Every structure is written in C-alpha cells, then in structure tokens.
Amino acid sequence: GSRRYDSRTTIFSPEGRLYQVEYALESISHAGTAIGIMASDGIVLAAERKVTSTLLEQDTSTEKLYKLNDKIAVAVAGLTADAEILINTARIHAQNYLKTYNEDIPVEILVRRLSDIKQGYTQHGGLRPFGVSFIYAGYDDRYGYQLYTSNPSGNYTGWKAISVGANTSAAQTLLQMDYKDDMKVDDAIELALKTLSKTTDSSALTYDRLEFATIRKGANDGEVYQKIFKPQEIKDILVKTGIT
Amino acid sequence: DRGVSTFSPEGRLFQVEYSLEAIKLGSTAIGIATKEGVVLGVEKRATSPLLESDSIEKIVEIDRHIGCAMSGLTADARSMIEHARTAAVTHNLYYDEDINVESLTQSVCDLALRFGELMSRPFGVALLIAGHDADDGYQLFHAEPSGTFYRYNAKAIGSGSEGAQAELLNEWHSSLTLKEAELLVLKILKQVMEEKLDENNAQLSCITKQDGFKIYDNEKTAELIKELKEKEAAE
Amino acid sequence: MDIILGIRVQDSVILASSKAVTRGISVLKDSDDKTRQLSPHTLMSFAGEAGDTVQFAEYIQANIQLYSIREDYELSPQAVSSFVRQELAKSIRSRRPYQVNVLIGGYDKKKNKPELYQIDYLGTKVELPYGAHGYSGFYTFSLLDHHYRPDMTTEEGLDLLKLCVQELEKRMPMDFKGVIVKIVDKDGIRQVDDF
Amino acid sequence: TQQPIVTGTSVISMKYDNGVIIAADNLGSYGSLLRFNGVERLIPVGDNTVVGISGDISDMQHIERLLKDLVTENAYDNPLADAEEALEPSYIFEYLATVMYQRRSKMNPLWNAIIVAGVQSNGDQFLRYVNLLGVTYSSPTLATGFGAHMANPLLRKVVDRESDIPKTTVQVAEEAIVNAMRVLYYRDARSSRNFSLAIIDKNTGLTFKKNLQVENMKWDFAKDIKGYGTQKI
Amino acid sequence: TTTLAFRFQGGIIVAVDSRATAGNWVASQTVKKVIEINPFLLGTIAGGAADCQFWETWLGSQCRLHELREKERISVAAASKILSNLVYQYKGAGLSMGTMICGYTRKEGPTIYYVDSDGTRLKGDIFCVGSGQTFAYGVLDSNYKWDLSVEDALYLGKRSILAAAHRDAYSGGSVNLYHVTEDGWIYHGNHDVGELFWKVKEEEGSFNNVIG
Amino acid sequence: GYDRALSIFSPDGHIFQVEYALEAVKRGTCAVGVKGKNCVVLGCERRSTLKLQDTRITPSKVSKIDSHVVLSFSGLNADSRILIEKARVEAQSHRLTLEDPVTVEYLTRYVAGVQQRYTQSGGVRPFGVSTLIAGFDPRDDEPKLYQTEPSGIYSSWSAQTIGRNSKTVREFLEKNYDRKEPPATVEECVKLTVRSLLEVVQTGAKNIEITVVKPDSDIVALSSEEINQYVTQIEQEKQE
Amino acid sequence: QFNPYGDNGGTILGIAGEDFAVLAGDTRNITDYSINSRYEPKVFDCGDNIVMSANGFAADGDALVKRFKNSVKWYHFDHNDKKLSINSAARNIQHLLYGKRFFPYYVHTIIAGLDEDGKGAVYSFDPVGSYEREQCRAGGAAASLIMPFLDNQVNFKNQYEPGTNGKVKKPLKYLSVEEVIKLVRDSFTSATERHIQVGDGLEILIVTKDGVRKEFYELKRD
Amino acid sequence: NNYDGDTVTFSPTGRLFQVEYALEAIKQGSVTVGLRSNTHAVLVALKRNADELSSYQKKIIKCDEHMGLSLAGLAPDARVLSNYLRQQCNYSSLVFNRKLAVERAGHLLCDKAQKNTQSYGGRPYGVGLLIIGYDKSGAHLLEFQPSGNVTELYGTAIGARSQGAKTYLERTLDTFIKIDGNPDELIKAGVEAISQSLRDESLTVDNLSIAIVGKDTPFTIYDGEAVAKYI
Ligand SMILES: *[C@@](C)(CO)[C@](*)(O)[C@H](CC(C)C)NC(=O)[C@H](Cc1ccccc1)NC(=O)[C@H](CC(C)C)NC(=O)[C@H](CCc1ccccc1)NC(=O)CN1CCOCC1
C-alpha cells in the first residue's frame, strides 16, 4: 500500500533526536538573521531581509516583522508561508482570550499555545514540522517587557537579548559582550544594528535590506505603542548611529 | 519496512514472535495450582537499591476470586488488568454471580490480537491468571500476546522460565498442600534469581475459596523463607 | 435556593446567602452554604434550578483553579466574571441550559478595590454596588437605594445587611432559615459565624 | 408516523383437512371513494404460500417487492431452491413479522394487517397473522378488519377448535369463505363485489381463483320495507 | 415509600418500609429498600423502583471497581457523588430516584448523603425521603436527641416508619432496620407492621385514634 | 488519520522507538529527587551555555501539578508540557468527582499511563521524557517520591536522579543516602541534594534550581543567594 | 397519530413449592372486544429448567422471550455450557428490560424454576426491570382478582389459629403440586367468570428437577 | 521474495504469498479428521499440549444445535470465524425461523476470508476449518481454507501429517459412507483414520477429541473419560 512512500516525519533517531526537527533547524540557519533586544523601558526587533533585489517594492512589504496584537509582535526566521499559517492562528488565539476574559492575552500564554502547536507536528499526524523560528516581543501588566523564542521542536525560552536565523553563534557572542541590564531602548536600537552590521553576509548594511520595530511605553502615560519602522525611518536611524 | 500483521514463511506472525522475546527478558513469575489453593509468586528485581521495592506491583487482584501475576513489559499489563477487572465486575452486574476463571482469561486474550493497521502492536507481557470457581475449582492459566491461553497445574514465565519449568515438572504432584506449594515457589525462585532471595526482592500470594485472593506481607513471607532454609538443611 | 445578596462597600464585598434547601412541603436542610471559592480573593454565590446550581458552581471553580495552577497567578474578579458570563451565554442556546443565577464578589489586588458582579442564567452581567437575585431584589434594592453609601466600612455594611435580612424575614412568604454571610477583602475570604 | 391513504379492506382465511383457504376483495379505497377496482391483494410466494394483505396499498406494494426479492435471494447459490431448501410459509412469515416489528419500533410502521396462509413441506397447515404493531397470532380461522368481526364468527361455526380441522373438507370450507365474502359485501362500506380466492392444498397444490363475484344475494325483501316507523306508502 | 436515616452518638440508624405500589394497587409488601453496597456502605431507595434498584446496583459495581483500582474503600462522599453525577446526566429524561447514601469511613466518620434524580446532593444528620417522609419527620424530629442510646435510636427509627406506614396510604408492609457503626453495618431484622402496630399500641399506649 | 505503527517490536524483542526516547532523556539536563524525614526536595540542572537569558519568564524546570504535588523532568522540553497539562487537568477532575485531591501515587500512575498509551498507539511516537513526581498525600505527613519513564513503568524511590550524567549522581546518592536514617531536617535534605548535583553540574551559580515541598501544600522555590549559601558551605567543608 | 403499543389481554400466574414450581397462563389472545386466538401459548420453556411468560403487549412479550431465549444460548457459548441459575437469569432479564427504559416493553414478566439449593423459585418483573423473588405472583389483566386470593391461600394471610384470640397466626407451610394445581385452576375459573379478557383455555408448565411437564385445561369460551 | 510484504500484492507468476504463508500455519497445526455417512457426520481431532503440566488445546467448537467445526492453525482466528458462524446461524433462526444450510455456512466463510486477502492493512486468516452439520438435505462435511476456497466432501483431514488419514479415507470411502444409523461405528472409522497420521505418540484419554451430529443427534462434543470407549 502507501506505507512504501512514508517518510515517517515524527520518529526518533538512535541517538534520541527528532530527524525532521533537526533538519528544519538546519533550514532556518540559512534564513536572514533576526535580533531581539529587551531594555528596561522597551524592546527592539531588528531583522535582515533575504538578498534584496533593486526592483523589489520595499515600502509596501512584510517579510520578517509581523503584528499579533496591539501589545505583541514577532520576528520571523525560516519559511514565510509557514510563518503566516502560525501567525493567523496566534492572532486568532489572542482574540479568543480577549473575548473570554475581557483582558489582553499575557505574552507567555500566547507563546506557549503557539509552541504547543509546533510540538504537535513533531509527535503525531505524520506531517512535516513548520520550518519557522519566532522571536516574540511583547508587553503585559504582569511581567512587563518580555522576549521569547520558539523553534520547530515546540520548545520556547525567555531572553534579555537573542538572535535567530543565520550567524546566531557570532551574533550571540556580540550581544553577550555589549549588553547590560540597565540599558535603554535607544541604546538597544544601536546594539541591534551594530550586531547585524558585523554578522551580515552582505557587503554593507543598508536601509532597503532591513526591517525594524520597537515596543516602547513612549506613548502618553502608562500605555504601550508598537512602531513598525518605515523605509525612510530606517534610513534616518541608520545614519544617526553612524553605520552609513 | 513491513506490515505489522505480516506472516513469516514458517506461518507465524512476526510481531507476536518478537513480543515473546521481550517476555523472556522480563522478571521471573511462578504459579502452582493445588486442591487447597493456587499460589502465585514473582521476582521483583529492583534496578537499584534506592528504589523502594514495596512499590513494585507485579502481583495484582482482578476480583476477590481471581488473581494475576505478570512478566515482561509490565507497563503494558495495566490496560489488560483494567479490562479484566471491568469484565469481572460487569459480569457480576449482568448475572449476579462470580465469573469463571476461564471466561475471564478468554476475555483478556481477545484483546491480544486486536492490533494492526485497534492498537499498534501486540502486548509485550505474559500473564499468569490464577483463580477459583464452583464449576472447575482451582485453576491456573497462562495468557500470551498470541491470543492463546493454556491451563496449567504449574507454570513459570520470565527469564528463568525454562529452568524453573523443568524443576516444576519433577516437583509437582496432585496431592500438594498449600504450605508445600508456597515453599516450592520460594525454592524455585531462589534457584533462578540472580540476587539472593529475601522478603524484599520476592513476593508471594495465593487464592483460596474461603479467604479469596491475598497478597502476603513481607513479615509472613520472611517466615516462609526461614522455614524453607531450615527444611533443606535438615537432610 | 432562593435568597442571595451582595453589597460592595469601601474596602470589601459582602455576600449573604440563604441556608434553606426545600423540596415539596419539606425543608430538607437549614444549614446549606450556597457559595464556592473560585480563588483566594474571589467568591461566587449561586441560586436557581436544583442540581444545576452546584454542578455549575463546581465546574467554574474547577476551571478557575486549573488556570491558577497553570499560570501560578490569580485571575482578576473582572476576568473571572467575564469567563462565567461566557459560559452562561453559551449555555442558554444549548440543548439543556444551566438555570443558574450567580453573584461574583471579589477583591482586585492590583487595583486594591472590591468588586461585585451580578450575572443571570442568560449571561447578563452587570457590575453593581449592591446586588440580588430572585424575589429578594424587590425588597432589598429600594432599601439599599435609601440606606447605602459608597464610603461605608465593613461593619457598617454588615448592619446594612442585617437591615435587609430583617425586612425579608418580615415580608417574604417562605421561611429561608437565615443566611450565611461571607466577607471578601484584601486578606481573602472569611465567614461571619454569628449572624 | 404515517396515515394510510389508498387502503384495502378485510382479508379472511381458514384451515381445512388437507390445507388452507384465503380470500380478499379486489378494491383499493381512497377514503370513502372506491377509487381502484383491479387491485390484487393476494400475493403467492412460490407454489406453497399466499400472503393476504390489508391496509395501506403503497406499503402492500413495498411488501410485494420484498417477497419477490426474497425468492430471488433464496435461489442464489442454492441447488435445492425448488426442493428441500425452498421457501416455507413459516420462513416467509417470520421474515415479515421481523420487519413489521422493526418498523413499529422505529415509529415508522408498514400500515398493514397481513395473513400468511400456506402448507409446510411436511404437510402441516400454516396460518398466521401479523400487523403494523408486530403483533402475531395463529388460529384455525383468521381475518382482518371487518372480517374479524363478521367472518370469524361464521368460520368458527365450521372450525371452532383444532379437532374440527380434519372433519372439514375443501368443499365445506370454500363454501363458508364465499358466504363470508357475501356478508362482508352486505355490511362493509369499503368492500367490493369482485374478489380473489386462493386454496393451498397439500395434495393438489396451489389453486388461485381470480375475478370471482358475490352471488345468490337476498335483496327482494327490500321492496316491502317502507318509511322508518309509521308511513304506510 | 417511606425511608429515613439519622446520625447520632452511636453511629447511624437507617430504617425503611417495604411496600411497592402501582397507583392505588398494592403490588408488593416485601420489597427490600436498603441496598447493601458493601460492609461499610448502605443505600436507601425511594421513587421509581426500577430506576433506584438498577442504578444503586450499578453504584455497587462502581464502588467495587474503585477499591480494586485504589486499594482502598471508597468514601461516602465519592460514592454519593458517582450516583449524583450519573442521574444529573439523565436530568430531564424522567428518572425518579430519592436515595440516601449512608456509611462509615476513617477519614469522614459516620456520614449520610441525600441524593435525588434532579441532581440535588446534600450532606446532613437527619433525612426522611418518600411519599410518607413528612409523617416520619413528625415523630423523628420531636423525639430526636444526639445522646440517644443504640437501643432507643433503633426504636425511634422503627417507630417513625411505623407512624408513616400507618398514615401514608402508599407506605407499609414491614420495617427493615439497620445500624451503622465504625465496624460496619449491622442488620436489625424485618418487622411486619401487621404485628408491630398492635405490639407498639399496647406497650406504648399510643395510637388512641384507632379502635383498640 | 495517520495510522502508522511507529512503536513496534524488533527481532531481539526490543521496541527501539521507546529505547531511543530514553536516549533523549539521557541527553536532557540532570534532575534529582531526594526525600527526607518530613520533606522532599527536587534539584534540577540548568546548562550554562545559555547567557543573556531572562530567568523571570523562562519556563521553570519544576512544575506544580496541584498545590501539594510537583513534577520535574528530564528530556524533551516541549513534550514535558503536554504531560504536565494532562496531569493538571486530571488533578482538577479528581477533586471534582472524588471531592479529594489526588494522591502522589495516583497522579504518577496517570502520567505513566499516558506515556504507555503513546508506546502502542498508531501515528504517535513515545514521549522523550522521564519525570520525577513528588509531594504529600492529603492529610498525610509521609513524603512521596515517584519516577516515570517513556515505556510507562513507574516506581517509588527514597532518592533518585534522571537526565545526563545521572549515573554519576545516582552513584553518589547510593552511598550517601541511609535508608535507616534519612535527612531529619529540611536543611540536611537540601544540602544532600545540592551536594549530589555538585558532582555533575560545573558551577553552583545560576545552574542549580532547588524546590522544597513540605506537608499541607507547603511548596517554595529557593532563590540564587539561598542556594549559593549551600554551595559556599559545602566547598569549605570539602577542603579538608 | 401512530400508537406503537396495544393490549393483547390475558393473565398469568406463578406459584413456588418446596421442590417444584408452576407457571400458568390462559391461552386467549384479544384486541379490544375481539378474540384473536383461543389457543395462543404465552408460557415458554427457555432451557436450563427456566419457564418464562411476558404478558401484556404480545409483540413486546414475544420480542423479550425471544431475546432471553437467545441470551441463554449465548450464555452457554461464552461460559463453557454452564447452567444459567434462576437468580442469574432474573438479573439478566432486568438488564434486557431496563435497556429499553425510555421506550419500554409493555409487559409484566414472570419466570419460574428451581434455585441452586433445588427449591422452587418464582421471580416477577415490572415493565422497566425491577424484580423480586416471591413464593407467589399473578400478572396481567386479572392479576387484581387472583393475587389477593393467593395471599390468602398460599401465604395464609389474615388467617389465624382457631380459638387463640387472633394471637397465633396460621403457620406457613409448603404446598404439594396437587394442592397448587387446584389453586391455579380455581384462580383461573374465577378470573374467567369475572374478567372478559380471560378464558378459552389454561396451560400450566410445571418445573421439577426431572424437567418441564405441561398440563392443559379447558376454560369458558364466552 | 519482493512480493510477500502484504496480501495486496501479486507475484509475477500470479501468486499471493501472504495467503500461502497463512496456509503454512495450518500444516504446522495438529491433525484433525472429518467424515460422514448419510445419517451422521463426525469430527475427530488430535489435541496438542505445551507440556505435561499443561492442558490440551481444544480443537472443536459448536456453532449451533445442528452445526460445528474443528480447527487447525491459529486458534484465535478459529474463534473469530466460529463466532461469525454462530451469529449467521443465529440470524437465520431469529429472522427466518430457519436452520442455516451447511452449504450457505461455507459460502459465508469464503466471502469473509476473501475480503481479508484483497485489502491493504488487514491479513488473511491463519486457520483451516472442518465444518460438519445436518440440515434439510442430510449430513454434510466442508473443508475451509483461508484462501477462501471451501469444498464439500465425503471425508477429509487437515493439519500436520494429514495425508495419511486422507489416503485412508480415500480407500475406505465405500465402507464408511454406508454406516447409516450407527454413530459408534462411524466414530470408530474416524478414530482409525486419524490413527494413520500418528507418529511416536498414541491416542490417550485426555488427548483424543470427538464430535458428532446427525438425524436425531444434536452437535455434541466428547472429551475426557467419554472418549475412553474408542481407544
Ligand atoms: C413508595 C412505596 C410508593 O411511592 C415508594 O416510593 C416506592 C419505591 C420502592 C418500590 C423502591 N415506589 C413505588 O412503589 C413506585 C411508585 C412509582 C410508580 C411509577 C413511577 C414512579 C414511582 N412503583 C413502581 O415503580 C412500580 C413497582 C412495581 C409495581 C413492582 N412499577 C410500576 O408502576 C411500573 C413501572 C412504571 C414505570 C416507570 C418508568 C417508566 C415506565 C414505567 N408500571 C407498571 O407496572 C404499570 N402497570 C400496568 C398495569 O398494571 C398496573 C401496573
């Protein structure tokens, strides 16, 4: 019958590893680098677009940074199509929580549920896992500003600063070097860009090959604002830090 | 790979034959049937000295008149015991009577071959089902994952099964008392066991018409072990 | 199941619930506690159809307790009340709806404010300074309209509550065998043994 | 839940020494309207059974198809289909009786009263009744509808108990049936003059008589009856 | 029916009548309305005969399965709640059951639970259930004290059923007595009302309404 | 539905998928359980290759199943969440029907049963997780400590360890733990647990987690400084 | 609207002796004011020395008997030809009846035989399965006529010892098969006189350790 | 070789190897014999034991008062198929008030076994059956094979060394067929037939198993001291 053609996506290796999860991570390691940095008064999300073409429409484009609700955003690394499936699920889950409790969903709860979906594809169903790693950046009134990451295994962990995708080994070393706990957002913006500028496979880091976002309490009195940076706004912040 | 319910050229189900190998790796379990009762005994086999041996439950009650001992992948036995207990209680509900030991065994063995591509594989555990009823009296059954069950006067399963079975062949007779049978299980267990037999790493049980199925205490078994050693040294 | 009251004061929420359980022409019990603790700072009293009431209360209690363990965190009274309303809002369009009316009294530790919610079996939620279900409201609301002040103490609230029970004992047709009173505040939930 | 539309009236039957007789008129009533006049309500199954059906005709036609299909199914992989393993009256009845009760139990009954008349392989007479409720009973005489009220009394004067069966000939038995059919024409408002009659004998086999008519009627005395009490003219 | 059970100093008394009716037709005078679930648990039955008998017989099977699985006798609370959760599933379907789960355990002590077919479940010290419950309540409440002796408590339970058997047309036959202690339930005999009434009348001097 | 029998027998009588699930457990960070006279202590390793972590929000290794029972684990982290969730639901379901919280044995038996079901169900692989379940039964002061594993077998332990280099720490506990006289106090039990982890961990900074469970739903997690005091005390006594 | 139930009339009677038991029933089958059959048996030998009758709505009665007969057959297959004891049969029947709790078999069922001590046994069932062992039971249309007569003659109710001032009751004792059949025949002739649905014939099945014997008697046919 | 992985695959020569491997399980099974006259039909079965301490595996199963079979191969598969036959015999009784024909009994088994040989996932039955019965057309004997093939015979035998008993019956055909109105002599012929398949072992009291059905004889099984007459 059909047994002959079954790849058996949800099994263990002799060493106790999940083949498909490991190979999905190998796929993600070639994707454009994404960095998250959490400060005391906000969070930064920075991401490098995958080898941009000059005729690509840059201003009306969304590849790396997506908005889940007013308080939570994600940076993507891997298959974009796969990420969008998961993103719409995450957007729906957030609205179900708001509908039920009349309160915005706590960041971890959203992250856990999305990570539980990924886990399911590794243990049952016989389907390939999602070739996607997220960096979640969000705020709630319990823990304040939070950074998480999830990967195809469905395992998630919290971070002060973290990178996913390509050159994470080099990127994590540089973040570990210059990061400190009493850091501000404006400083974190500078760190994120400097790290990408050194780890990039490109010749020089430019505005058209970047997506950028911040989550500050920079709005008027005790409320959070999400700022997805425009092309011209990235151009200005890149000059202001002295990269171009 | 290959189908789960596939026949070998010799005419046997591969998976059933492989599950039998798993049962040979399991700890030893012995059962002896007499006219005064049926005795069930098992090797606990703790993997480490820190493991609390009293939590090793390899002898199990199905009803007041039916007991069970296991050997092999003992985790697989849980759903088999659950089914047996439900089958026993359910029959009492439908017919206001105790259920025959054979009928109980048959019910358990019907699960055995309900696997394929139902559960994904056969059970990796053999069961010794001992009990009593008004019709056929004291009985001992050996239930395999093949769906087959044999009645036995005495039976040993597990790693030291072939050595113990040969010993049971010589020692068993139709006029055995309960006390004699108790000692005989302890004697044969001590012979095939790796570590030295005591009250902590071996367990005894029995089923009689009067008192029903009873698992012996560690204090009671200890005295039977001491009584056994003295009798062997006495000649 | 008949009389359940609730009064939110300055620093606490006070719930009074009748002790009588009647079937037919017999009072089967006169010491019944018509409430469940949903969380350390949230209490839900209930009244309605026999069987449905306790089945619903305990089902809610189980769900809230499950949430508390999962997140190691206590839900706000507002969040609990919204969860309860949605359950009743589903229920009403089911094959057999829960015929249960509830009051949810709780103390919000983040806001440092007491909160009283009144929800009927249809899933109709309202936050109130004082609330009641069943025929009780027809006496107690007008009484509280007159005597209630928003800045009252817990002791003043209990006297205000005594005034309600006295009126009900005077004018209600059925003997409801008094009430069990419970107070919900910053220090949690406690029962007034002598009322 | 149904209501019967096109309906058939009484089916009458009895046992005699060598076999059974069964009869039923050829009418398909539509309430008070005597709508259809060429309706056969006796249906033979093989050469040893006749099923007489009253009640709803659409449900009767369904049962016809079931019996027709039953013969076909029995013939499959059956070398002795016209011999030892042929359909018996008792087999045909029990099948119908099973269906009737299953349908009542699903609250969607076949709105009929059925009488299966026949002769078994060992020569024994078979005569048994079943209806929309799945109720079954046997007797030396059986009748449905008005037949139960008017035919049975007359037929029981001939065969009142089991011991009267060997004493009753086919001539006497047929005469009683034909007489009963006349009485039903006098007194049943949803009956017709034309009818069919079937004899299943253990010796002479199945004799199916069509296009019979009620005859030798008494109507002459009607001319002497005037008014409803006083009236003399 | 009339059934009662009350809690006191020396454990629990349980008493029931034995009549069964189909309208005004007295169908039986010898029905057993105390179901013996185990040596430490009793169940009273009132209402639909088949419903009560079938489901409490079923309850005993569920309690047996508990002690097989958990190696421990089921609590009175857990037993009563199995039954109450069962009947709650059938709520609206028309089950008619008025039951009392009486028993002793170490953790609970003597305990009584009222359970009925519309889902009500109540813990309590005194309960009377059935068509003649009010008649039993009248005698029981007016003579009840916690400090009753085992002898006096047994009699009061018996006398309360007798009172109801007399007045309630749909109660009678005979009285079945039980006493529940820390050591388990003890049966205290079947008492035919035919002889018991006259015996009680003469000795007690009560029932002066009746022609002696 | 995906039906494939992934867990099956091999010629030598082994279920490789279950055994490969054990290898995943062996890869996982070390976890240890030690029970004293009036308490149980759950120690857990945290690998120090991960700096720039946020310890406030990162999922803790020890999880509360109810107010009186806790569950730690070794193996696949994502798999452990599924077992913990199922166990937490069953804990509430038990309180609802039996009107009494779960025993530690019952909760363990349930979790172990779930693990077993995944070893002979079509379309699924076994859980790459072994658990240590500890706590106190309702109205009981006797400490309980149980272990489960992917196959579904479970058992009680005076003290036990699982995860990477667990065979080293098990060797330590086997000679240091006395059955006749267990750790009499909370301090003695915690010290023995920290000592045992110090045989394997590396540094006693933010690598060791300790959680103490006491009778009547009295569970508390130790902070960095509190744990560091035990590390400082042990090292000074070691130099002798 | 379609009514799935009907009343086929008739009446049945069970009496237990010391080492025997009888189950009697008239052979008349009716609907409304018409006789359907003067001889339609409704007391059946079901095997294992168990006789059974399910009086009331004949279609449900036949269905139930048919199912219990089948239950006995499968009891032998599943449990090594073991004899189904009368107490076990009774409990089994309860589950058959209660199985249709929400669409009942409209019948009063009675079974008779010998218990495991060899003593006579009679069990009776309501339509939804509640059962009880008794020395004595009448069921069906004329049960209200026959039953009190049985209380008086079988269980000696309201009968006291002469000259004892109504203080000593008439002592209970088992009846002989000859005395029981007399009470059965008198019960049915009396019921035939005063109940229109009872008559035509009487069929008695007697159960002893030797087997199941039958006896038939004529009743009035009006 | 490459075409025996499952039942759904044909070999290049047009063979079904999984069905043939199921057939092989029958040859390993203990011998059982079937034979009939015009009045009676008899099953004789050699039961097998695990060892001296064990019981002897029961080979004969009753399906109805007028029908039953003996098994050879996987016993659980015989339980599934005999249970199906019980239900079909029972369906014929309840619905049609008709004893199921032995020929139809065979047709039903054939069709049940066939479905398992044409579908993916399932497997063929690993047992052979000898069905005897007495219906409206006299005594019958059938031979069921899990390939689906059912065959009506005067006599036959299946299992290990069944060729010896099958040769004997082929010689004795003219003799035993006319054993009418004599049960004990028809059994004797069956016991002598199965004796031609014995090696080293002989027929003992708890080893032999006999069953019979006929004109005025319901299907009954004889074991233990009841078969001591025929040794
Ligand atoms: C006191 C004694 C009276 O209320 C108790 O409450 C007892 C409880 C004891 C028996 C456990 N209750 C009854 O006796 C109970 C009253 C009752 C009747 C009907 C519904 C609910 C409660 N009686 C019964 O249950 C009788 C018991 C028989 C006679 C032994 N059973 C019936 O009345 C049956 C079944 C009724 C039924 C319930 C639910 C669905 C379908 C049917 N009905 C008949 O026997 C009908 N019958 C037909 C013509 O003959 C008269 C009786």
Short mmCIF file of C-alpha atoms in Angstrom, two decimals, chain D residues 62 66 93-110 130-136, chain G residues 2 4 57 59-60 63 66-67 100 103 105, chain H residues 91 94-96:
data_model
loop_
_atom_site.label_atom_id
_atom_site.label_comp_id
_atom_site.label_asym_id
_atom_site.label_seq_id
_atom_site.Cartn_x
_atom_site.Cartn_y
_atom_site.Cartn_z
CA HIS D 62 -43.48 -2.45 -0.97
CA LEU D 66 -39.69 -7.62 -0.63
CA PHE D 93 -43.98 -15.19 7.82
CA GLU D 94 -41.15 -14.82 10.35
CA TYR D 95 -39.34 -12.53 7.90
CA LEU D 96 -42.38 -10.25 7.54
CA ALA D 97 -43.07 -10.41 11.30
CA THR D 98 -39.47 -9.31 11.92
CA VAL D 99 -39.85 -6.36 9.52
CA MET D 100 -43.25 -5.28 10.89
CA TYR D 101 -41.93 -5.10 14.48
CA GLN D 102 -38.65 -3.38 13.48
CA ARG D 103 -40.67 -0.72 11.65
CA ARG D 104 -43.08 -0.12 14.56
CA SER D 105 -40.03 0.10 16.83
CA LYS D 106 -38.65 2.90 14.62
CA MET D 107 -42.05 4.69 14.84
CA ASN D 108 -42.46 4.31 11.06
CA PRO D 109 -44.74 1.29 10.56
CA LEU D 110 -45.91 -0.51 7.44
CA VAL D 130 -49.18 -10.13 11.73
CA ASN D 131 -49.90 -6.38 11.74
CA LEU D 132 -48.39 -2.87 11.86
CA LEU D 133 -47.63 -3.30 15.60
CA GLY D 134 -45.68 -6.54 15.03
CA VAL D 135 -48.40 -8.44 16.91
CA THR D 136 -48.63 -12.09 15.85
CA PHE G 2 -49.47 6.25 15.46
CA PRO G 4 -46.90 1.75 18.97
CA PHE G 57 -48.47 -6.36 24.69
CA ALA G 59 -45.36 -8.18 20.27
CA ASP G 60 -43.12 -6.89 23.09
CA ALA G 63 -39.65 -9.98 21.50
CA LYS G 66 -37.12 -14.40 22.05
CA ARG G 67 -34.22 -12.26 23.36
CA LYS G 100 -35.35 -0.02 26.89
CA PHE G 103 -39.16 3.03 25.18
CA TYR G 105 -41.54 -3.37 26.76
CA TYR H 91 -29.60 -14.64 12.34
CA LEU H 94 -34.41 -15.33 14.56
CA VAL H 95 -35.34 -13.70 11.24
CA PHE H 96 -36.49 -16.64 9.08
#
